[PDB]
Amino acid sequence: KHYRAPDHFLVGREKIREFAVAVKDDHPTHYSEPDAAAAGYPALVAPLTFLAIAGRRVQLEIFTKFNIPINIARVFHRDQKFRFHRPILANDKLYFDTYLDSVIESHGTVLAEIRSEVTDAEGKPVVTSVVTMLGEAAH
Amino acid sequence: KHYRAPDHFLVGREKIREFAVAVKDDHPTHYSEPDAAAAGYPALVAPLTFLAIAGRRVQLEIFTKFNIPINIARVFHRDQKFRFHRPILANDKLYFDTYLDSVIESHGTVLAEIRSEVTDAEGKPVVTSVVTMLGEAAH
Amino acid sequence: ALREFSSVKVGDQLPEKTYPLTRQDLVNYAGVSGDLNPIHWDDEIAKVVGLDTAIAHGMLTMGIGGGYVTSWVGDPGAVTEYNVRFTAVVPVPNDGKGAELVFNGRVKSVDPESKSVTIALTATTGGKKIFGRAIASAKL
Amino acid sequence: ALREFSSVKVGDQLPEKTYPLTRQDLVNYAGVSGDLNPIHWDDEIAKVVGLDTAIAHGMLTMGIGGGYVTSWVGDPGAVTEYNVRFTAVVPVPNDGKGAELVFNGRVKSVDPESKSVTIALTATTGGKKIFGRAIASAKL
């Protein structure tokens, strides 16, 4: 099961700051661009879990496109993994290739492992995000 | 009373869509860039009240910098006016020059009129925003 | 789909849209806008200040209005002015139904030399109007 | 302020920060993230599914953790991996106090050829830990 998301997610400068405040991150590389320059980064760098924004649309959508046998009512987010190959910076264009690595179905409960490879505009990897949904079986 | 905001507000492509959904605007010029091209606009155009985002930081701040005699507890937003000199588009750099046009203080209640001229990166006017706060007097 | 100036003319009533508004829509807007005032999402705070239930944000309601106008005009970039006075509040109960904003409009002015057309607007909840003088103008 | 690899070494306990977390912080995150699930801001919905009160978002808590790690590392762009399993929930009552996340950390691995250092993390609410295996790694 491959799924390539049409269109990219465009990392906003202001949405970065907005998010960092929401998760109580106060590191200057998120708020002032000169500090990002001091750290050695052209634009504002994004908080480590910023992909929860970009990946919101993906996870909602891939459930249907993958036909995962899980009941949304009783589903639970068990595992989150990020391999930051390259830091996410403001004005980054982010493309998503989402794969279904595995499904396990035992008594009552189905455990699904979902991998999204994030690539930039050019097509070089940015972050490898792995999600593990745990839920009540449908079929 | 002049106040010039340091730094600009950078209109995000994705924050535009995010906002348009929040105010139930479903006009394609906010969501798909080709439709914006069809309408005759390079980037995504922003909803008419998008400045509520950018102007959030301003209105919170100018209250103190202007020494308006009003009690925040009992203050009320009475009037909002936008003169869109030029449409706000994605990737616009927005600068704020905020002026205190008038203050009226009668029995119990103070009425304040606050004007923010929004200029772009170059320095040409984008939107003229006028706010009218109504509140309980402090002095 | 910016409409031509010749199509619309003074007296043209605008099609009524009825926007539903839930408590979830108020929470979303709180975060999107950064207006985290509890009166818009905590009832017990709403009653302390003297309200029945939590109320919609003022700029949420006006923001919705922009959609109602921008659709008819056909182009957001065409709108030249949008002005509103807030007369009343829009209460949104956490009852699984919420509330409804009924929007209406009427062209009250045209300047044929310009491409300008001016719409008077009327937004209501349960009949009570929430805006005083509420207008919009656009180049067609 | 990315710290040099030579400074830190295995066994280094990390300074504990205690993050307060109010119901307003849950509403803000709902809108910012677009996760509008009522269990995170409506108590009566929380109890129907069988919870005491409304709970913090899973990714809010992990997101906070990123701050706790990124500060110590000195550079967000330096972090190479951030992995967390969610074991429990963080209830946040609308009581005007909310809840507190106590974060802790310990370097468990260094690779001197690389600039890699790995931190084991521990987040707790009222003593109960909310994460299982929770690690972070960064190039120093």
D touches which chains (3+ CB pairs under 8 A)? A, C
Q: Which residues of B touch A10 (CB under 8 A)?
A: 12-14
Chain D environment of C30 (Cβ under 8 Å):
27-28, 30-31
* H helix count then E strand count, chain B: 3, 6
**Strand, coil or helix: C135:** strand
C2 contacts on B by Cβ (under 8 Å):
39
Residues in chain C: 140
**B46 interaction partners in chain C (CB closer than 8 Å):** 76
User: What is the longest distance spanned by two Cα atoms in chain B?
Assistant: 55
C-alpha distances (whole Å) from D81 to each of A28, A48, A82, A131 are: 20, 9, 5, 14
- All residues of chain C having their beta carbon less than 8 Å from the beta carbon of residue B29 are 75-77
Asked whether the beta carbons of residue D41 and residue C34 sit closer than 8 angstroms, the reply is: no
Interface probe for D, chosen from A15, A21, A24 (most Cβ of D below 10 Å), is A24
Q: Using the beta-carbon criterion (under 8 Å), do C76 and B24 form an inter-chain contact?
A: no
Q: How far apart are CA B88 and CA C23, in angstroms?
A: 29
Strand partners, D104: D122
Q: How far is B135 from chain C (nearest CA, A)?
A: 14
Could you give the CA distance from residue B135 to residue B127 in angstroms, rounded to a whole number? 26
d(CA A18, CA A90): 13
What range defines the domain where residue C52 resides? 1-140
Indicate yes or no: CB of C86 within 8 angstroms of CB of B80: yes
In degrees and rounded to multiples of 5, residue C63 shows phi and psi of -60, -45
Assigned token pair, A111: 């455990």
Cβ contact A90:A11 at 8 Å? yes
Interface test with C, best of B16, B19, B23 (most C CBs within 10 A): B23
Question: Does C59 sit within 8 Å of B80, measured CB to CB?
Answer: yes
The method recorded for this entry reads X-ray
| Contact call for residues C60 and B23 (beta carbons, < 8 A) | yes
Contacts for A103 with CB less than 8 Å, ≥ 6 apart? A68, A69, A110, A111, A112, A113
Considering its fold, how many domains does chain C have in total? 1
Chain A positions touching D24 (Cβ under 8 A) are none
Interface test with B, best of C69, C83, C131, C133 (most B CBs within 10 A): C83
Q: Which residues of B touch C51 (CB under 8 A)?
A: none
Cβ distance of A84 and D81 shorter than 8 Å: yes
Asked if B49's CB is within 8 angstroms of C66's CB, the reply is yes
Residue C63 with chain B: CB contacts under 8 Å: 19, 22-23, 25, 47-49, 52
Beta strands in chain B (DSSP E): 2-4, 9-10, 70-84, 93-105, 109-119, 125-137
Structural domains in chain A, sorted by start: 2-137 (3.10.129.10)
What is the sign, positive or negative, of the torsion defined by CA atoms of B15, C22, D26, D137?
Answer: negative
Q: 3-class secondary structure for C19-64?
A: EEECHHHHHHHHHHHCCCCHHHCCHHHHHHCCCCCCECCHHHHHHH
Tell the burial category of A115 from Cβ atoms under 10 Å away from its Cβ (0-12, 13-18, 19+).
Answer: middle
Q: Given an 8 Å threshold on Cβ–Cβ distance, is B12 in contact with A9? A: no
Nearest by CB to residue D34, choosing from A29, A47, A56, is A56
Structural resolution in Å: 2.0
Q: Indicate the DSSP class of residue A28.
A: G
User: Cβ–Cβ contacts within 10 Å for residue D8, how many?
Assistant: 18
Helix (H) or strand (E) holding C119: strand C116-125
Q: What are the DSSP calls for chain D, one per residue?
A: -PPPTTT--TT-EEEEEEEEE-HHHHHHHHHHHT---GGGT-HHHHHHTT-SS-B--HHHHHHHHHHHHHHHHS-GGGEEEEEEEE-S--B--SSSS-EEEEEEEEEEEEETTTTEEEEEEEEEETTEE-EEEEEEEEE-
- Cβ contact, residue pair B14, A13, below 8 Å: no
Angle between helices A13-22 and D58-73 (to 10 degrees): 100
* Interface contact C71, partner B, CB < 8 A: yes
Question: B68-72: long-range contacts at Cβ-Cβ below 8 A with a sequence spacing of 24 or more?
Answer: B68/B100, B68/B103, B68/B110, B68/B112, B68/B133, B69/B103, B69/B105, B69/B110, B69/B137, B69/B138, B69/B139, B70/B110, B70/B112, B70/B133, B70/B135, B70/B136, B70/B137, B70/B138, B71/B135, B71/B136, B71/B137, B71/B138, B72/B135
Tokens read off for D67: 């701050």
Q: How far apart, in whole angstroms, are the C-alpha atoms of residue A92 and residue A88?
A: 7
D56/D50 Cα distance (integer angstroms) = 15
Pick from B27, B53, B56: CB nearest C70: B27
Q: What is the CATH number of the domain that holds C68?
A: 3.10.129.10
Chain D residues whose CB is inside 8 A of the C38 CB are 24
Taking the Cβ of residue D123 and every Cβ of chain A, the question of whether any pair is shorter than 8 Å is answered with: no
Give the residue on A whose Cα is nearest the Cα of D1.
A39
User: Which residues are CB-neighbours of A71 under 8 A, at least 6 positions away?
Assistant: A135, A136, A137, A138
Length of chain D: 140
